[PDB]
Structure 1
Amino acid sequence: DFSHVFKEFAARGDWQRSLRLFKYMQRQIWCKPNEHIYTLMIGILGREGLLDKAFEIFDEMPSHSVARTVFSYTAIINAYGRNGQYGTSLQLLEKMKQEKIIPSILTYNTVINSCARGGHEWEGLLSLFAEMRHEGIQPDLVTYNTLLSACSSRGLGDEAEMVFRTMNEAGILPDVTTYSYLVDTFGKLGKLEKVSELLMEMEAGGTSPEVTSYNVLLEAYAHSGSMKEAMDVFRQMQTAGCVANAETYSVLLNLYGKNGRYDQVRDLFLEMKMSNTEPDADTYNILIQVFGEGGYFKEVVTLFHDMVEEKVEPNMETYEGLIYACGKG
Protein backbone atom coordinates (compact mmCIF):
# COMPACT_ATOMS: atom_id res chain seq x y z
CA ASP A 1 0.00 0.00 0.00
CA PHE A 2 2.91 2.33 0.74
CA SER A 3 4.55 1.67 -2.63
CA HIS A 4 1.31 2.39 -4.49
CA VAL A 5 0.82 5.63 -2.56
CA PHE A 6 4.40 6.65 -3.32
CA LYS A 7 3.90 5.89 -7.02
CA GLU A 8 0.69 7.93 -7.06
CA PHE A 9 2.43 10.84 -5.32
CA ALA A 10 5.28 10.70 -7.83
CA ALA A 11 2.82 10.63 -10.74
CA ARG A 12 0.98 13.60 -9.20
CA GLY A 13 4.16 15.50 -8.29
CA ASP A 14 3.59 15.42 -4.51
CA TRP A 15 7.26 15.19 -3.58
CA GLN A 16 6.83 17.01 -0.26
CA ARG A 17 4.00 14.75 0.91
CA SER A 18 5.96 11.66 -0.16
CA LEU A 19 9.06 12.85 1.71
CA ARG A 20 6.97 13.57 4.82
CA LEU A 21 5.36 10.13 4.65
CA PHE A 22 8.78 8.50 4.25
CA LYS A 23 10.21 10.44 7.20
CA TYR A 24 7.20 9.43 9.31
CA MET A 25 7.43 5.76 8.33
CA GLN A 26 11.18 5.73 9.04
CA ARG A 27 10.36 6.20 12.74
CA GLN A 28 7.61 3.54 12.74
CA ILE A 29 8.48 -0.09 13.48
CA TRP A 30 5.32 -1.50 11.88
CA CYS A 31 5.88 0.57 8.71
CA LYS A 32 9.63 0.43 8.17
CA PRO A 33 10.50 1.44 4.58
CA ASN A 34 12.19 -1.18 2.42
CA GLU A 35 14.59 -0.78 -0.50
CA HIS A 36 11.70 -0.33 -2.94
CA ILE A 37 10.27 2.61 -0.97
CA TYR A 38 13.75 4.16 -0.76
CA THR A 39 14.24 3.80 -4.52
CA LEU A 40 10.80 5.31 -5.17
CA MET A 41 11.59 8.26 -2.90
CA ILE A 42 14.97 8.76 -4.60
CA GLY A 43 13.30 8.74 -8.01
CA ILE A 44 10.61 11.18 -6.88
CA LEU A 45 13.32 13.49 -5.51
CA GLY A 46 15.35 13.27 -8.71
CA ARG A 47 12.31 13.97 -10.88
CA GLU A 48 11.76 17.27 -9.04
CA GLY A 49 15.46 18.20 -9.04
CA LEU A 50 16.14 17.47 -5.35
CA LEU A 51 19.60 16.00 -5.81
CA ASP A 52 20.66 16.83 -2.24
CA LYS A 53 17.58 15.20 -0.71
CA ALA A 54 18.00 12.12 -2.90
CA PHE A 55 21.67 11.83 -1.93
CA GLU A 56 20.78 12.19 1.76
CA ILE A 57 18.08 9.52 1.46
CA PHE A 58 20.52 7.19 -0.30
CA ASP A 59 23.19 7.78 2.36
CA GLU A 60 20.73 7.21 5.22
CA MET A 61 20.06 3.69 3.89
CA PRO A 62 23.06 2.20 5.75
CA SER A 63 21.91 3.76 9.03
CA HIS A 64 18.40 2.34 8.55
CA SER A 65 19.68 -1.14 7.58
CA VAL A 66 18.36 -0.75 4.03
CA ALA A 67 19.87 -2.97 1.34
CA ARG A 68 21.50 -1.32 -1.68
CA THR A 69 21.07 -2.67 -5.21
CA VAL A 70 22.15 -1.85 -8.75
CA PHE A 71 18.79 -0.09 -9.18
CA SER A 72 19.83 2.80 -6.93
CA TYR A 73 23.15 3.19 -8.76
CA THR A 74 21.37 3.20 -12.13
CA ALA A 75 18.89 5.80 -10.86
CA ILE A 76 21.75 7.97 -9.58
CA ILE A 77 23.59 7.66 -12.90
CA ASN A 78 20.42 8.61 -14.79
CA ALA A 79 19.81 11.61 -12.53
CA TYR A 80 23.41 12.73 -13.05
CA GLY A 81 23.19 12.31 -16.82
CA ARG A 82 19.90 14.20 -17.00
CA ASN A 83 21.82 17.34 -15.94
CA GLY A 84 24.72 16.77 -18.34
CA GLN A 85 27.08 15.38 -15.67
CA TYR A 86 28.77 12.65 -17.69
CA GLY A 87 31.84 12.70 -15.45
CA THR A 88 29.68 12.18 -12.36
CA SER A 89 27.96 9.22 -14.04
CA LEU A 90 31.34 7.72 -14.96
CA GLN A 91 32.58 8.19 -11.39
CA LEU A 92 29.43 6.54 -10.02
CA LEU A 93 29.85 3.62 -12.43
CA GLU A 94 33.49 3.22 -11.38
CA LYS A 95 32.50 3.31 -7.71
CA MET A 96 29.80 0.69 -8.30
CA LYS A 97 32.32 -1.50 -10.12
CA GLN A 98 34.76 -1.11 -7.23
CA GLU A 99 31.97 -2.01 -4.78
CA LYS A 100 31.58 -5.48 -6.39
CA ILE A 101 28.26 -4.40 -7.93
CA ILE A 102 27.73 -6.07 -11.31
CA PRO A 103 26.39 -3.44 -13.74
CA SER A 104 23.38 -4.24 -15.90
CA ILE A 105 22.47 -3.45 -19.50
CA LEU A 106 20.22 -0.58 -18.38
CA THR A 107 23.04 1.04 -16.40
CA TYR A 108 25.42 0.75 -19.36
CA ASN A 109 22.81 2.24 -21.71
CA THR A 110 22.18 5.12 -19.29
CA VAL A 111 25.93 5.77 -18.99
CA ILE A 112 26.29 5.75 -22.78
CA ASN A 113 23.36 8.16 -23.13
CA SER A 114 24.85 10.46 -20.48
CA CYS A 115 28.23 10.42 -22.23
CA ALA A 116 26.57 11.20 -25.56
CA ARG A 117 24.50 14.05 -24.12
CA GLY A 118 27.42 15.55 -22.18
CA GLY A 119 29.57 15.92 -25.29
CA HIS A 120 32.08 13.12 -24.73
CA GLU A 121 34.29 11.98 -27.60
CA TRP A 122 33.36 8.96 -29.71
CA GLU A 123 36.45 7.16 -28.38
CA GLY A 124 34.97 7.14 -24.88
CA LEU A 125 31.67 5.73 -26.11
CA LEU A 126 33.50 3.05 -28.11
CA SER A 127 35.58 2.11 -25.06
CA LEU A 128 32.45 1.93 -22.90
CA PHE A 129 30.73 -0.28 -25.48
CA ALA A 130 33.79 -2.55 -25.66
CA GLU A 131 33.92 -2.80 -21.86
CA MET A 132 30.20 -3.63 -21.74
CA ARG A 133 30.62 -6.31 -24.42
CA HIS A 134 33.60 -7.77 -22.55
CA GLU A 135 31.40 -7.97 -19.42
CA GLY A 136 28.67 -10.02 -21.11
CA ILE A 137 26.08 -7.28 -21.59
CA GLN A 138 22.63 -8.09 -22.97
CA PRO A 139 21.40 -6.19 -26.04
CA ASP A 140 17.85 -4.86 -26.25
CA LEU A 141 15.67 -3.06 -28.78
CA VAL A 142 15.80 0.23 -26.87
CA THR A 143 19.46 -0.50 -26.17
CA TYR A 144 20.04 -1.01 -29.90
CA ASN A 145 18.26 2.28 -30.64
CA THR A 146 20.43 4.07 -28.07
CA LEU A 147 23.61 2.49 -29.47
CA LEU A 148 22.61 3.63 -32.97
CA SER A 149 21.86 7.14 -31.68
CA ALA A 150 25.23 7.26 -29.90
CA CYS A 151 27.29 7.23 -33.10
CA SER A 152 24.87 9.80 -34.53
CA SER A 153 25.52 12.08 -31.55
CA ARG A 154 29.24 11.53 -32.19
CA GLY A 155 28.79 13.64 -35.33
CA LEU A 156 31.58 12.07 -37.38
CA GLY A 157 31.03 10.96 -40.96
CA ASP A 158 32.54 7.54 -40.27
CA GLU A 159 30.49 7.41 -37.06
CA ALA A 160 27.34 8.23 -39.04
CA GLU A 161 28.13 5.52 -41.59
CA MET A 162 28.75 3.03 -38.76
CA VAL A 163 25.44 3.98 -37.11
CA PHE A 164 23.66 3.50 -40.43
CA ARG A 165 25.34 0.14 -41.11
CA THR A 166 25.06 -1.33 -37.59
CA MET A 167 21.40 -2.21 -38.18
CA ASN A 168 21.94 -3.42 -41.75
CA GLU A 169 25.09 -5.55 -41.62
CA ALA A 170 24.27 -7.22 -38.29
CA GLY A 171 20.87 -8.35 -39.60
CA ILE A 172 19.01 -6.84 -36.62
CA LEU A 173 17.29 -3.52 -37.34
CA PRO A 174 14.48 -1.72 -35.48
CA ASP A 175 11.30 -0.71 -37.27
CA VAL A 176 11.31 3.11 -37.04
CA THR A 177 13.61 4.35 -34.26
CA THR A 178 16.93 3.00 -35.56
CA TYR A 179 16.07 3.86 -39.16
CA SER A 180 15.16 7.43 -38.21
CA TYR A 181 18.33 7.80 -36.14
CA LEU A 182 20.46 6.47 -39.01
CA VAL A 183 18.76 8.81 -41.48
CA ASP A 184 19.34 11.78 -39.17
CA THR A 185 22.99 10.75 -38.85
CA PHE A 186 23.48 10.35 -42.61
CA GLY A 187 21.83 13.72 -43.28
CA LYS A 188 24.59 15.64 -41.50
CA LEU A 189 27.55 13.87 -43.12
CA GLY A 190 25.68 13.62 -46.42
CA LYS A 191 23.51 10.69 -47.54
CA LEU A 192 24.38 10.23 -51.21
CA GLU A 193 22.52 6.91 -51.37
CA LYS A 194 21.56 6.26 -47.73
CA VAL A 195 18.51 8.56 -47.93
CA SER A 196 16.53 6.09 -50.04
CA GLU A 197 18.30 3.15 -48.39
CA LEU A 198 16.94 3.99 -44.93
CA LEU A 199 13.41 4.34 -46.30
CA MET A 200 13.71 1.03 -48.15
CA GLU A 201 15.02 -0.73 -45.03
CA MET A 202 12.19 0.73 -42.95
CA GLU A 203 9.55 -0.28 -45.51
CA ALA A 204 10.71 -3.77 -46.54
CA GLY A 205 11.88 -4.74 -43.04
CA GLY A 206 8.50 -6.32 -42.35
CA THR A 207 6.48 -3.28 -41.29
CA SER A 208 5.10 -0.52 -43.50
CA PRO A 209 7.14 2.71 -43.33
CA GLU A 210 5.59 5.11 -40.84
CA VAL A 211 4.14 8.39 -42.10
CA THR A 212 6.55 10.28 -39.83
CA SER A 213 9.58 8.48 -41.29
CA TYR A 214 8.44 9.01 -44.88
CA ASN A 215 7.76 12.69 -44.16
CA VAL A 216 11.23 13.03 -42.63
CA LEU A 217 12.74 11.40 -45.72
CA LEU A 218 10.80 13.79 -47.96
CA GLU A 219 11.94 16.77 -45.87
CA ALA A 220 15.56 15.59 -46.12
CA TYR A 221 15.21 15.20 -49.89
CA ALA A 222 13.71 18.69 -50.19
CA HIS A 223 16.45 20.18 -47.99
CA SER A 224 19.10 18.75 -50.31
CA GLY A 225 17.15 20.16 -53.26
CA SER A 226 16.25 16.90 -55.02
CA MET A 227 12.73 17.40 -56.36
CA LYS A 228 12.68 13.90 -57.88
CA GLU A 229 13.69 12.27 -54.59
CA ALA A 230 11.04 14.28 -52.74
CA MET A 231 8.37 13.15 -55.22
CA ASP A 232 9.54 9.55 -54.81
CA VAL A 233 9.35 9.88 -51.01
CA PHE A 234 5.83 11.32 -51.29
CA ARG A 235 4.75 8.47 -53.58
CA GLN A 236 6.24 5.96 -51.14
CA MET A 237 4.38 7.60 -48.26
CA GLN A 238 1.13 7.41 -50.23
CA THR A 239 1.74 3.77 -51.20
CA ALA A 240 2.71 2.69 -47.68
CA GLY A 241 -0.84 3.36 -46.47
CA CYS A 242 0.18 4.94 -43.16
CA VAL A 243 -2.09 7.76 -41.99
CA ALA A 244 -0.34 10.95 -43.10
CA ASN A 245 -1.45 14.54 -42.57
CA ALA A 246 -0.87 17.46 -44.96
CA GLU A 247 2.63 18.12 -43.61
CA THR A 248 4.23 16.33 -46.57
CA TYR A 249 1.76 18.16 -48.83
CA SER A 250 2.89 21.51 -47.41
CA VAL A 251 6.54 20.48 -47.82
CA LEU A 252 5.87 19.60 -51.46
CA LEU A 253 4.07 22.91 -51.94
CA ASN A 254 7.05 24.80 -50.51
CA LEU A 255 9.28 22.84 -52.91
CA TYR A 256 7.03 22.97 -55.99
CA GLY A 257 6.60 26.60 -55.08
CA LYS A 258 10.37 26.93 -55.23
CA ASN A 259 10.04 25.58 -58.76
CA GLY A 260 7.25 28.10 -59.17
CA ARG A 261 5.19 25.95 -61.47
CA TYR A 262 3.25 25.07 -58.35
CA ASP A 263 1.54 22.42 -60.42
CA GLN A 264 3.00 19.78 -58.18
CA VAL A 265 1.91 21.85 -55.21
CA ARG A 266 -1.56 22.10 -56.71
CA ASP A 267 -1.52 18.34 -57.03
CA LEU A 268 -0.42 18.04 -53.40
CA PHE A 269 -3.44 20.12 -52.39
CA LEU A 270 -5.76 18.00 -54.55
CA GLU A 271 -4.25 14.82 -53.11
CA MET A 272 -4.81 16.15 -49.59
CA LYS A 273 -8.40 17.03 -50.49
CA MET A 274 -9.10 13.60 -51.98
CA SER A 275 -7.32 11.43 -49.39
CA ASN A 276 -8.92 13.39 -46.50
CA THR A 277 -5.58 14.67 -45.24
CA GLU A 278 -5.59 16.86 -42.15
CA PRO A 279 -6.02 20.45 -43.44
CA ASP A 280 -3.68 23.05 -41.95
CA ALA A 281 -4.18 26.82 -42.01
CA ASP A 282 -0.41 27.36 -42.15
CA THR A 283 -0.25 25.20 -45.29
CA TYR A 284 -3.09 27.28 -46.76
CA ASN A 285 -1.19 30.49 -45.98
CA ILE A 286 2.01 29.10 -47.51
CA LEU A 287 0.37 27.87 -50.71
CA ILE A 288 -1.70 31.03 -51.09
CA GLN A 289 1.35 33.26 -50.75
CA VAL A 290 3.25 31.33 -53.39
CA PHE A 291 0.25 31.34 -55.70
CA GLY A 292 -0.34 35.04 -55.13
CA GLU A 293 3.21 35.99 -56.07
CA GLY A 294 2.81 33.93 -59.22
CA GLY A 295 -0.55 35.40 -60.16
CA TYR A 296 -3.95 33.74 -59.76
CA PHE A 297 -5.45 36.69 -57.90
CA LYS A 298 -8.88 35.28 -58.74
CA GLU A 299 -7.83 31.82 -57.56
CA VAL A 300 -6.67 33.39 -54.28
CA VAL A 301 -10.06 35.09 -53.88
CA THR A 302 -11.81 31.78 -54.59
CA LEU A 303 -9.56 30.04 -52.05
CA PHE A 304 -10.46 32.66 -49.44
CA HIS A 305 -14.16 32.24 -50.23
CA ASP A 306 -13.79 28.46 -49.86
CA MET A 307 -11.86 28.74 -46.59
CA VAL A 308 -14.67 30.98 -45.32
CA GLU A 309 -16.98 27.97 -45.54
CA GLU A 310 -14.21 25.58 -44.45
CA LYS A 311 -14.53 27.05 -40.92
CA VAL A 312 -10.74 27.47 -40.75
CA GLU A 313 -9.74 30.40 -38.58
CA PRO A 314 -7.32 32.67 -40.50
CA ASN A 315 -4.09 34.27 -39.30
CA MET A 316 -1.92 37.33 -39.85
CA GLU A 317 -0.01 35.61 -42.67
CA THR A 318 -3.10 34.31 -44.49
CA TYR A 319 -4.94 37.65 -44.35
CA GLU A 320 -1.76 39.50 -45.34
CA GLY A 321 -1.22 37.27 -48.37
CA LEU A 322 -4.87 37.52 -49.41
CA ILE A 323 -4.92 41.31 -49.18
CA TYR A 324 -1.58 41.48 -51.01
CA ALA A 325 -3.00 39.39 -53.85
CA CYS A 326 -6.10 41.60 -53.87
CA GLY A 327 -4.04 44.80 -54.01
CA LYS A 328 -1.76 43.47 -56.74
CA GLY A 329 -4.61 42.16 -58.90
Structure 2
Amino acid sequence: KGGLHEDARKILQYMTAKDVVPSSKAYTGVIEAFGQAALYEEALVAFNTMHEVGSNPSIETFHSLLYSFARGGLFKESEVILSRLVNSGIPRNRDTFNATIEAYKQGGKFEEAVKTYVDMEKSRCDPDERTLEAVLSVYSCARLVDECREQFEEMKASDILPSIMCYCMMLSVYGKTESWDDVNELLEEMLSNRVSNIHQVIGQMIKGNYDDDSNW
Protein backbone atom coordinates (compact mmCIF):
# COMPACT_ATOMS: atom_id res chain seq x y z
CA LYS A 1 0.00 0.00 0.00
CA GLY A 2 2.79 2.43 0.93
CA GLY A 3 5.03 1.36 -1.95
CA LEU A 4 8.04 0.22 0.11
CA HIS A 5 9.44 -2.28 -2.36
CA GLU A 6 12.79 -2.60 -0.57
CA ASP A 7 11.15 -3.71 2.68
CA ALA A 8 8.82 -6.04 0.78
CA ARG A 9 11.79 -7.72 -0.91
CA LYS A 10 13.46 -8.28 2.47
CA ILE A 11 10.30 -9.92 3.83
CA LEU A 12 10.23 -12.38 0.94
CA GLN A 13 13.93 -13.19 1.36
CA TYR A 14 13.43 -13.66 5.10
CA MET A 15 10.57 -16.10 4.43
CA THR A 16 12.61 -18.07 1.89
CA ALA A 17 15.65 -18.14 4.19
CA LYS A 18 13.41 -19.78 6.83
CA ASP A 19 12.10 -22.39 4.33
CA VAL A 20 8.66 -20.74 4.39
CA VAL A 21 6.58 -20.83 1.20
CA PRO A 22 4.78 -17.46 1.00
CA SER A 23 1.05 -17.45 0.43
CA SER A 24 -0.61 -16.28 -2.77
CA LYS A 25 -1.79 -13.18 -0.90
CA ALA A 26 1.71 -12.43 0.41
CA TYR A 27 3.15 -12.28 -3.11
CA THR A 28 0.32 -10.01 -4.28
CA GLY A 29 1.45 -7.43 -1.73
CA VAL A 30 5.00 -7.64 -3.09
CA ILE A 31 3.65 -7.27 -6.64
CA GLU A 32 1.71 -4.23 -5.42
CA ALA A 33 4.81 -2.55 -3.97
CA PHE A 34 6.85 -2.88 -7.16
CA GLY A 35 4.06 -1.37 -9.25
CA GLN A 36 3.94 1.58 -6.85
CA ALA A 37 7.60 2.27 -7.69
CA ALA A 38 7.17 1.55 -11.44
CA LEU A 39 9.45 -1.50 -11.15
CA TYR A 40 7.60 -3.62 -13.68
CA GLU A 41 10.53 -6.01 -14.17
CA GLU A 42 10.63 -6.99 -10.50
CA ALA A 43 6.82 -7.08 -10.29
CA LEU A 44 6.54 -9.59 -13.13
CA VAL A 45 9.29 -11.71 -11.57
CA ALA A 46 7.19 -12.05 -8.41
CA PHE A 47 4.19 -12.85 -10.61
CA ASN A 48 6.29 -15.52 -12.32
CA THR A 49 7.56 -16.91 -9.01
CA MET A 50 4.00 -17.39 -7.72
CA HIS A 51 3.37 -20.22 -10.18
CA GLU A 52 6.80 -21.64 -9.31
CA VAL A 53 5.91 -22.07 -5.62
CA GLY A 54 2.32 -23.11 -6.36
CA SER A 55 0.81 -19.95 -4.84
CA ASN A 56 -1.39 -19.35 -7.86
CA PRO A 57 -2.61 -15.77 -8.35
CA SER A 58 -6.00 -14.74 -7.02
CA ILE A 59 -8.38 -12.16 -8.48
CA GLU A 60 -6.70 -9.47 -6.38
CA THR A 61 -3.33 -10.29 -7.96
CA PHE A 62 -4.71 -9.58 -11.44
CA HIS A 63 -5.80 -6.19 -10.07
CA SER A 64 -2.42 -5.24 -8.61
CA LEU A 65 -0.93 -5.65 -12.09
CA LEU A 66 -3.79 -3.83 -13.84
CA TYR A 67 -3.53 -0.76 -11.61
CA SER A 68 0.27 -0.88 -11.86
CA PHE A 69 0.06 -0.98 -15.66
CA ALA A 70 -2.74 1.60 -15.76
CA ARG A 71 -0.61 4.32 -14.18
CA GLY A 72 2.09 3.86 -16.82
CA GLY A 73 -0.30 3.58 -19.74
CA LEU A 74 0.82 0.05 -20.65
CA PHE A 75 -2.38 -0.99 -22.38
CA LYS A 76 -0.46 -3.71 -24.24
CA GLU A 77 0.23 -5.40 -20.90
CA SER A 78 -3.28 -4.58 -19.66
CA GLU A 79 -4.79 -6.43 -22.64
CA VAL A 80 -2.58 -9.42 -21.80
CA ILE A 81 -4.21 -9.60 -18.36
CA LEU A 82 -7.65 -9.06 -19.90
CA SER A 83 -7.04 -11.80 -22.47
CA ARG A 84 -5.83 -13.93 -19.56
CA LEU A 85 -8.80 -13.11 -17.31
CA VAL A 86 -11.37 -14.39 -19.81
CA ASN A 87 -9.79 -17.85 -20.15
CA SER A 88 -9.03 -18.04 -16.41
CA GLY A 89 -12.74 -18.11 -15.59
CA ILE A 90 -12.70 -14.60 -14.08
CA PRO A 91 -15.52 -12.30 -15.27
CA ARG A 92 -14.76 -8.63 -15.81
CA ASN A 93 -15.76 -6.75 -12.67
CA ARG A 94 -15.95 -2.96 -12.33
CA ASP A 95 -12.39 -2.61 -11.02
CA THR A 96 -11.03 -4.26 -14.17
CA PHE A 97 -12.96 -1.77 -16.31
CA ASN A 98 -11.56 1.22 -14.40
CA ALA A 99 -7.97 0.10 -14.98
CA THR A 100 -8.69 -0.42 -18.69
CA ILE A 101 -9.95 3.16 -19.03
CA GLU A 102 -7.03 4.51 -16.99
CA ALA A 103 -4.49 2.48 -19.00
CA TYR A 104 -5.90 3.59 -22.36
CA LYS A 105 -6.10 7.21 -21.18
CA GLN A 106 -2.48 7.38 -19.99
CA GLY A 107 -1.44 5.59 -23.19
CA GLY A 108 -3.08 8.27 -25.32
CA LYS A 109 -5.78 5.97 -26.74
CA PHE A 110 -8.74 8.30 -26.25
CA GLU A 111 -11.03 6.52 -28.73
CA GLU A 112 -10.49 3.11 -27.12
CA ALA A 113 -10.95 4.59 -23.63
CA VAL A 114 -14.50 5.82 -24.29
CA LYS A 115 -15.30 2.58 -26.13
CA THR A 116 -14.52 0.64 -22.95
CA TYR A 117 -16.88 2.97 -21.09
CA VAL A 118 -19.33 2.50 -23.96
CA ASP A 119 -18.97 -1.29 -23.81
CA MET A 120 -19.07 -1.25 -20.00
CA GLU A 121 -22.67 -0.02 -19.89
CA LYS A 122 -23.76 -2.69 -22.38
CA SER A 123 -22.59 -5.38 -19.93
CA ARG A 124 -24.64 -3.79 -17.12
CA CYS A 125 -22.33 -3.52 -14.10
CA ASP A 126 -22.42 -0.44 -11.85
CA PRO A 127 -19.95 2.42 -12.43
CA ASP A 128 -18.55 3.72 -9.15
CA GLU A 129 -17.17 7.16 -8.27
CA ARG A 130 -13.69 6.37 -9.62
CA THR A 131 -15.20 5.20 -12.92
CA LEU A 132 -16.80 8.62 -13.35
CA GLU A 133 -13.44 10.14 -12.42
CA ALA A 134 -11.74 7.70 -14.80
CA VAL A 135 -13.85 8.81 -17.77
CA LEU A 136 -13.69 12.46 -16.71
CA SER A 137 -9.90 12.43 -17.03
CA VAL A 138 -10.31 11.14 -20.60
CA TYR A 139 -12.50 14.07 -21.64
CA SER A 140 -10.41 16.56 -19.67
CA CYS A 141 -7.22 15.28 -21.30
CA ALA A 142 -8.64 15.69 -24.82
CA ARG A 143 -9.84 19.28 -24.20
CA LEU A 144 -13.59 18.59 -24.21
CA VAL A 145 -15.07 21.53 -22.30
CA ASP A 146 -18.75 20.84 -23.00
CA GLU A 147 -18.42 17.09 -22.41
CA CYS A 148 -16.60 17.71 -19.12
CA ARG A 149 -19.43 20.01 -17.99
CA GLU A 150 -21.99 17.25 -18.59
CA GLN A 151 -19.78 14.81 -16.68
CA PHE A 152 -19.22 17.17 -13.74
CA GLU A 153 -22.70 18.37 -12.79
CA GLU A 154 -24.03 14.81 -12.99
CA MET A 155 -21.40 13.94 -10.37
CA LYS A 156 -23.15 16.34 -7.98
CA ALA A 157 -26.59 15.55 -9.42
CA SER A 158 -26.63 12.48 -7.16
CA ASP A 159 -25.24 14.39 -4.14
CA ILE A 160 -21.81 12.75 -4.25
CA LEU A 161 -19.56 15.78 -3.52
CA PRO A 162 -16.86 14.95 -6.10
CA SER A 163 -13.35 14.64 -4.72
CA ILE A 164 -10.57 17.18 -5.19
CA MET A 165 -9.22 15.23 -8.18
CA CYS A 166 -12.32 15.93 -10.28
CA TYR A 167 -12.20 19.61 -9.28
CA CYS A 168 -8.57 19.89 -10.39
CA MET A 169 -9.44 18.30 -13.74
CA MET A 170 -12.10 20.97 -14.30
CA LEU A 171 -9.53 23.72 -13.78
CA SER A 172 -7.34 22.03 -16.41
CA VAL A 173 -10.00 21.88 -19.13
CA TYR A 174 -11.03 25.47 -18.37
CA GLY A 175 -7.41 26.62 -18.16
CA LYS A 176 -6.49 24.79 -21.37
CA THR A 177 -9.14 26.72 -23.32
CA GLU A 178 -8.37 29.96 -21.41
CA SER A 179 -11.96 30.01 -20.09
CA TRP A 180 -11.11 32.33 -17.22
CA ASP A 181 -14.80 32.84 -16.43
CA ASP A 182 -15.41 29.20 -15.51
CA VAL A 183 -12.15 28.97 -13.54
CA ASN A 184 -13.21 31.73 -11.16
CA GLU A 185 -16.72 30.25 -10.90
CA LEU A 186 -15.36 26.87 -9.80
CA LEU A 187 -12.73 28.33 -7.46
CA GLU A 188 -15.39 30.15 -5.44
CA GLU A 189 -17.14 26.79 -4.99
CA MET A 190 -13.97 25.36 -3.43
CA LEU A 191 -13.31 28.47 -1.33
CA SER A 192 -16.34 28.04 0.94
CA ASN A 193 -16.80 24.23 0.93
CA ARG A 194 -18.07 24.09 4.51
CA VAL A 195 -18.23 20.27 4.38
CA SER A 196 -14.79 19.27 3.01
CA ASN A 197 -11.57 20.77 4.37
CA ILE A 198 -9.29 19.38 1.65
CA HIS A 199 -11.03 21.32 -1.13
CA GLN A 200 -10.89 24.58 0.84
CA VAL A 201 -7.15 24.40 1.57
CA ILE A 202 -6.20 23.15 -1.90
CA GLY A 203 -8.52 25.62 -3.60
CA GLN A 204 -7.11 28.46 -1.50
CA MET A 205 -3.49 27.47 -2.16
CA ILE A 206 -4.06 27.38 -5.93
CA LYS A 207 -4.88 31.10 -5.94
CA GLY A 208 -1.70 31.78 -3.96
CA ASN A 209 -3.24 32.75 -0.62
CA TYR A 210 -1.21 30.13 1.27
CA ASP A 211 2.24 30.83 -0.23
CA ASP A 212 3.70 32.20 3.02
CA ASP A 213 6.15 30.54 5.39
CA SER A 214 3.59 30.09 8.17
CA ASN A 215 0.73 29.71 5.67
CA TRP A 216 2.40 26.76 3.92
Q: TM-score, normalised by structure 2?
A: 0.75
Q: Does the 8 Å CA contact 1:38/1:58 hold for their aligned counterparts? A: yes
Q: Tell me how far 1:125 sits from its aligned partner.
A: 1.7
Q: Tell me which of 3, 7, 25 is aligned to 1:36.
A: 25
Corresponding residue to 2:210 among 240, 245, 256: 245
**Cα distance in structure 1, aligned partners of 2:127 and 2:194:** 21
Larger Rg: 1
Match of 2:116 in 1: 128
2:13 aligned residue (12, 20, 43): 20
Q: Which structure 2 residues correspond to residues 289-300 of structure 1 after superposition, within 5 A? A: none
| Aligned-pair CA distance for 1:279 | 7.1
1:99 aligns to 2:108 (yes or no): no
Identity fraction in percent: 23
Matches within 5 A, 1:121-160: 121=110, 123-160=111-148
Question: RMSD between aligned alpha carbons?
Answer: 3.5
In 1, Cα distance between equivalents of 2:6 and 2:116: 35
Partners of 1:149 and 1:181 within 8 A in 2 = yes
Q: Distance in 2 between matches of 1:177 and 1:48?
A: 21
Residues of 1 paired with 2:63 and 2:190: CA distance?
32
Give the AA of the match of 1:245. Answer: Y
Contact 2:9–2:30 (CA under 8 A) maintained in structure 1: no
Q: Report the Cα distance in structure 1 between the residues aligned to 2:193 and 2:157, rounded to whole angstroms.
A: 13
Query: In the TM superposition, what whole-angstrom CA distance separates every residue of 1:249-308 from its partner, at most 9, and x where no partner exists?
Result: xxxxxxxxxxxxxxxxxxxxxxxxxxxx8479xxxxxxxxxxxxxxxxxxxxxxxxxxxx
Q: Is residue 66–residue 81 contact of structure 2 (8 Å, CA) maintained in 1?
A: yes
Look up the match of 2:60: 71
Q: Are the structure 2 counterparts of residues 161 and 64 from structure 1 closer, same or farther at C-alpha, using a change threshold of 3 Å?
A: same
1:39: how far off?
Answer: 0.7
Following the alignment from structure 2 to structure 1, what is the Cα–Cα distance between the partners of residues 182 and 37? 41
Q: Cα distance, 1:47 vs. partner? A: 4.1
Instruction: Give secondary structure in 2 for the equivalent of 1:13.
Output: helix
Letter of the structure 2 residue corresponding to residue 134 of structure 1: K
Aligned match for 1:182, one of 170, 178, 202: 170
More RCO (CA 8 Å, sep 6+): 2
Structure 2 unmatched runs, 5+: none
Q: Tell me, in whole angstroms, the C-alpha distance in 1 between the residues paired with 2:94 and 2:74.
A: 20
Normalization by structure 1: what TM-score? 0.53
Query: Is 2:48 the counterpart of 1:59?
Result: yes
1:327 aligns with none
How far 1:205 moved relative to its partner?
6.5
**What SS is found at the alignment partner of 1:61?**
helix
The separation in 2 between residues aligned to 1:105 and 1:131, in whole angstroms, is 12
Aligned residue identity for 2:4:
A
Q: Deviations over 1:109-162 (max 9, x none)?
A: 2222222211112x2221111333334444444444333323212323444434
Deviates more, 1:105-114 or 1:43-52: 43-52
Q: Tell me if the contact between 2:15 and 2:21 (Cα under 8 Å) persists in the aligned partners.
A: no
SS in 2 for 1:70: coil
Partner of 1:213: 203
Q: Whole-Å Cα distance in 2 between the matches of residues 246 and 59 of structure 1?
A: 48
Query: Separation in 2 of the partners of 1:98 and 1:141?
Result: 29
Give the corresponding residue for 1:11.
4
The unaligned stretches of length 5 or more in structure 1 are 1-6, 220-243, 248-276, 281-329
The question of whether the paired residues in 2 share the 8 Å contact of 1:42 and 1:58 is answered with yes
- The amino acid across from 1:102 in the alignment is P
Q: Structure 2 vs 1, CA of residues 33 and 174 (structure 1 numbering), >3 Å: closer, same or farther?
A: same
Deviates more, 1:63-72 or 1:14-23: 14-23
Q: How many angstroms apart in 2 are the aligned matches of 1:155 and 1:91?
A: 30
Alignment deviations for residues 152-186 of structure 1 (CA, whole Å, 9 cap, x no partner)? 12323444434444425555441533222222222
1:284 corresponds to: none
Distance 2:215 2:56 in 1: 57
Partner letter of residue 194 of structure 1?
D
Aligned residues: 214
